[PDB]
Amino acid sequence: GRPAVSASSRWLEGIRKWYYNAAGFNKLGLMRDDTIHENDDVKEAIRRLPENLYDDRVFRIKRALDLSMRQQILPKEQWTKYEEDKSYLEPYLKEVIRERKEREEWAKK
Amino acid sequence: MLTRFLGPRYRQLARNWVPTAQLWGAVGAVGLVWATDWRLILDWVPYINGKFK
Amino acid sequence: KNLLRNALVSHLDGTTPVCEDIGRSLLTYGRRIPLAEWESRIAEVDARVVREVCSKYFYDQCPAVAGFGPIEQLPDYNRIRSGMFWLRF
Amino acid sequence: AEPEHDHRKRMGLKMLLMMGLLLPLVYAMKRHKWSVLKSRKLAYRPP
Amino acid sequence: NIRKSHPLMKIVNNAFIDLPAPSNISSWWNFGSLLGICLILQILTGLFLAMHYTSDTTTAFSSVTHICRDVNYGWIIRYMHANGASMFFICLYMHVGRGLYYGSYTFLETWNIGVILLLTVMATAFMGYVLPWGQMSFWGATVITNLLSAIPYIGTNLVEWIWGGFSVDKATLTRFFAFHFILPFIIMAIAMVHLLFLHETGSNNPTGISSDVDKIPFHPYYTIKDILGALLLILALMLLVLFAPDLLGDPDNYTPANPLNTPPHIKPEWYFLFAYAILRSIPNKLGGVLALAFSILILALIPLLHTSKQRSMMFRPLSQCLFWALVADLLTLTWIGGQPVEHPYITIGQLASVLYFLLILVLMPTAGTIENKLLKW
Ligand code: HEM
Numbered sequence: 001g002r003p004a005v006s007a008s009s010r011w012l013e014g015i016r017k018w019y020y021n022a023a024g025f026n027k028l029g030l031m032r033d034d035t036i037h038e039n040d041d042v043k044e045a046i047r048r049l050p051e052n053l054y055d056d057r058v059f060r061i062k063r064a065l066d067l068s069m070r071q072q073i074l075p076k077e078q079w080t081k082y083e084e085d086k087s088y089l090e091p092y093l094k095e096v097i098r099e100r101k102e103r104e105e106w107a108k109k
Numbered sequence: 110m111l112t113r114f115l116g117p118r119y120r121q122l123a124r125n126w127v128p129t130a131q132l133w134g135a136v137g138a139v140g141l142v143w144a145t146d147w148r149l150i151l152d153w154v155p156y157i158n159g160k161f162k
Numbered sequence: 163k164n165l166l167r168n169a170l171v172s173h174l175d176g177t178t179p180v181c182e183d184i185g186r187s188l189l190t191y192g193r194r195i196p197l198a199e200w201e202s203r204i205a206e207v208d209a210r211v212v213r214e215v216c217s218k219y220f221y222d223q224c225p226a227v228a229g230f231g232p233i234e235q236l237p238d239y240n241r242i243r244s245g246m247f248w249l250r251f
Numbered sequence: 252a253e254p255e256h257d258h259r260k261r262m263g264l265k266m267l268l269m270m271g272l273l274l275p276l277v278y279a280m281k282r283h284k285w286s287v288l289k290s291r292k293l294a295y296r297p298p
Numbered sequence: 299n300i301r302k303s304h305p306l307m308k309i310v311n312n313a314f315i316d317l318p319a320p321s322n323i324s325s326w327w328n329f330g331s332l333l334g335i336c337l338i339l340q341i342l343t344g345l346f347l348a349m350h351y352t353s354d355t356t357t358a359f360s361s362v363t364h365i366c367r368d369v370n371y372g373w374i375i376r377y378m379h380a381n382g383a384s385m386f387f388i389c390l391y392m393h394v395g396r397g398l399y400y401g402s403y404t405f406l407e408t409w410n411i412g413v414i415l416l417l418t419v420m421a422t423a424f425m426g427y428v429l430p431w432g433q434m435s436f437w438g439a440t441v442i443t444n445l446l447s448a449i450p451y452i453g454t455n456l457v458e459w460i461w462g463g464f465s466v467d468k469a470t471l472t473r474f475f476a477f478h479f480i481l482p483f484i485i486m487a488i489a490m491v492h493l494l495f496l497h498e499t500g501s502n503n504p505t506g507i508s509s510d511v512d513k514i515p516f517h518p519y520y521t522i523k524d525i526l527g528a529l530l531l532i533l534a535l536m537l538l539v540l541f542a543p544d545l546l547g548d549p550d551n552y553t554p555a556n557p558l559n560t561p562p563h564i565k566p567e568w569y570f571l572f573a574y575a576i577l578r579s580i581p582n583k584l585g586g587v588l589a590l591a592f593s594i595l596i597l598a599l600i601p602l603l604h605t606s607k608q609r610s611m612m613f614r615p616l617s618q619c620l621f622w623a624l625v626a627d628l629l630t631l632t633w634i635g636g637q638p639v640e641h642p643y644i645t646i647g648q649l650a651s652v653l654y655f656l657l658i659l660v661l662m663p664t665a666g667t668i669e670n671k672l673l674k675w
C-alpha cells in the first residue's frame with residue numbers, strides 16, 4: 001500500500017503550484033487557510049487555534065486587508081511560497097467536521 | 110423660575126458667546142440675502158450690480 | 163488658581179523637594195523664582211487668559227496620541243482631530 | 252422640436268466648468284482624510 | 299452632544315457615523331449609496347413632474363410637452379428623471395455584479411431583499427415609461443403586459459384585469475400613473491429593511507475574508523468616499539441631460555398614439571435588451587416568458603450554487619474568466635435584443651441564451667469545484 005513517485009505527479013503538482021501562483025493570495029502574504037470562507041464549522045476551527053496561530057493569522061489578515069485598501073502587494077521576496085504554505089487550520093477543521101457529522105448520524109436514528 | 114440661569118457665571122457665559130452669536134447672524138443674513146437675491150439689500154453692494162439700473 | 167497655589171506650596175515642603183527645586187530651577191530659568199512671583203503670575207490669570215492661552219495650544223491643533231491595550235474602541239485619528247475644534251465656534 | 256437647445260448647452264458648459272473645479276477639490280478632500288490610513292504602518296510584535 | 303442616546307440620531311449614528319466598516323471596500327461598494335441617491339433623485343424630479351403631468355389619454359403626451367416647453371425648467375427636470383432611470387439601472391447592474399463577483403450574496407436575507415428591490419424598480423420603470431403615451435410607450439406597454447397572457451388557464455382574465463378593458467387603453471394609463479407614484483415609496487421601505495439586514499453583519503470586502511480585525515468608522519472615510527462618488531454619478535447624469543437628452547430615448551415616443559399601427563422595429567429601452575433577447579430567442583409563447591422570468595429570477599438560485607471554499611473571486615482565476623464570459627455574454631444579449639429577429643441574429647441569440655444559463659447553472663459551480671481541488675481543499 002505505497003510505492004510510486006511519477007513524472008506525472010510533478011505535473012499535477014506543477015498544475016497546483018501554477019494555480020496557487022495564479023490565485024495570488026500569496027502576493028498579500030496570505031496563506032491558504034487565511035482565505036477560507038468562515039461558515040460555522042470554520043468559526044469553530046478558528047476558535048480552537050492555539051494563541052500563536054490564532055495571533056499570526058490575525059496579523060496576516062490585517063496585513064492583507066491593508067494591502068487590499070492600497071491595492072498594493074508585497075515585494076516578491078515576501079510572497080508565501082507554495083510548499084512553505086502551512087495547512088494550520090486543516091486538522092482543526094477536519095475534526096470539527098467529524099464531530100458535526102457524528103451529531104448528524106445520531107440525529108438520524 | 111428661569112431664575113436658575115440668573116447669576117454672575119451665566120452672565121459671563123452669555124458674554125463669551127456674543128461674538129459667536131453675532132457672527133452667526135452675519136452668516137445667516139448674508140446667506141438669506143444671497144439665496145433670494147434680495148433686490149433691496151443687494152442693490153447697495155458695489156459689484157453684484159447684475160441688475161443694471 | 164487656588165489649586166495651583168496649594169499645589170505649589172504643598173509641594174515645596176521639606177528639604178528634598180526644595181533642594182530639587184533650587185537645583186533644577188537654576189538649570190531651567192537660570193534663577194530661583196521666589197514664591198510671590200509665582201503668586202503674581204497666578205493672580206494675573208483670569209477667564210480671558212485661560213480662554214486665550216488654551217485656544218493657542220489646544221484649538222484646532224494636531225494632537226499626538228498614544229494607546230496601549232484593549233484599544234479597539236479608541237477613536238480614529240481624524241475623529242480625535244475633529245474633536246480639537248468646535249463647529250459652533 | 253427643441254427650444255431649450257441653447258440654454259441647455261450654456262448650462263452644460265457651466266456643468267463641465269464647475270465639475271472641473273469641484274471634482275479635483277472633493278477628490279483632494281477625500282485623500283486628505285484618507286491620508287492617515289494610506290500611510291499608516293503596521294508591526295507585529297508577539298511574545 | 300450625543301448622537302448615541304437620542305432615540306433618533308442613534309439610528310443615524312449606527313447607520314452612517316460609527317458603523318464599523320472594512321478598511322478595504324472598493325469603488326464597487328459605492329453603488330448602494332448611489333442607488334439611494336438615485337431613488338431620491340427619481341423621487342424629487344418625479345414629484346415636480348407630477349405637479350404638471352396629466353393622466354388622461356388625450357392630454358398625456360401633451361402635458362409632457364407642456365412641461366418641456368412651457369413650465370419653467372421642466373425640460374431639465376424631465377430629462378433628469380428619464381436619465382435618472384437609466385442611471386438607476388446602471389447602478390442596479392454594477393451592484394448586482396459586485397455581489398456576484400465578491401460572493402456578497404452569501405448574506406441571504408439582504409441579497410433576497412435586493413432581488414425584490416430589483417423587481418420593484420423594474421416594475422416601476424415599466425409603468426413610468428408608458429406614461430407619456432408615445433408609440434413605444436404604448437407598444438412596449440402592449441408587449442410586456444401580454445406576457446401575463448401566457449400563464450395557463452388564468453392568463454387572459456389577468457391581462458384584461460390589469461388592463462381594465464380589452465386592450466391597453468384609458469384605464470391602464472391612469473392606473474399606471476398611480477402605481478408608478480406609490481411604488482418608489484414602497485421601494486424606499488424595502489431598502490431600509492435591506493440596510494437593516496446588512497448591518498446585522500456589516501459589509502463584505504474584495505478579499506471575501508472577515509475584516510473585523512481591520513474595521514474603520516464609516517465616518518470621515520466613507521462619508522467622503524460617498525460624497526466624491528455622488529458627484530461622479532451627477533456628472534454622468536448631467537452629461538446625458540445636458541448634452542445628450544435624446545440618446546437612450548427612442549425617437550418614436552415623440553409621436554403620439556397608434557393602437558392601430560405598430561412601429562416597424564420596436565426597441566426596448568436599453569436595460570431590458572438582454573432579457574428581451576432571451577424571451578425572443580425561443581420560438582414559444584409560454585417558454586419565452588418562462589425563460590424571461592427565469593433570466594431574472596435566477597439571482598435567487600445563485601446562493602445554492604456557491605461551491606467554492608472561498609467567498610470572493612479575488613483569488614479565483616477560473617471563476618474570474620467565467621464571470622467576464624458572463625458579462626460578455628450579457629453584452630451580447632444586449633446587442634442582440636436591439637436587433638431584428640433575423641438570420642445571423644436569431645442563432646447568435648439562442649446560443650447566448652443557453653450560455654447565460656449554462657454558465658450560471660453549471661459552468662461557474664464546476665469552476666468552483668475544480669478550484670477547490672486544485673488547492674487541495
Ligand atoms: C416619486 C415617485 C415617482 C413619481 C411621482 C414619478 C412621476 C412620473 C411622471 C408624472 C412621469 C410622466 C412624465 C414624463 O414622462 O416625463 C414619469 C415618467 C417616468 N419615470 Fe417616474 N416617477 C416616480 C418614481 C420613478 C422611478 C422609481 C423610476 C424608475 C427609476 C422612474 C423612471 C421613470 C421613467 C422611465 C419614466 C418615463 C420617462 C420618459 O421617458 O418620459 N420614476 N414619472
Ligand code: HEM
Pocket residue numbers: 326327328329330331333334337390393394397401402403405408409410411412413414415416485489492493496501502503597
Ligand atoms: C433599491 C435597490 C437597492 C438599494 C437602494 C440598495 C442599497 C444598498 C446599500 C446602501 C448597501 C451598502 C454598501 C454598498 O454600497 O454596497 C448595499 C449592499 C448590498 N446590497 Fe443592495 N441595494 C439595492 C439593490 C440590491 C440588489 C438588486 C441586490 C441583489 C439582488 C442587493 C444585495 C446587496 C448586497 C448583497 C449587499 C452586500 C454588500 C457587500 O457585500 O458588499 N441590493 N445595498
Ligand SMILES: C[C@@]1(c2ccc(Oc3ccccc3)cc2)OC(=O)N(Nc2ccccc2)C1=O
Pocket residue numbers: 420421423424425427428434435437438439441442564565566567568569570573574594
Ligand atoms: C422601459 C421599458 C421597460 C421597463 C422595465 C422593464 O422591466 C424589466 C427590465 C429588465 C428585465 C426584466 C424586466 C422592461 C421594459 O418599458 C417599455 O415600455 N419598454 N419598451 C419595450 C419595447 C419593446 C418590447 C417591450 C418593451 C421598455 O424598454
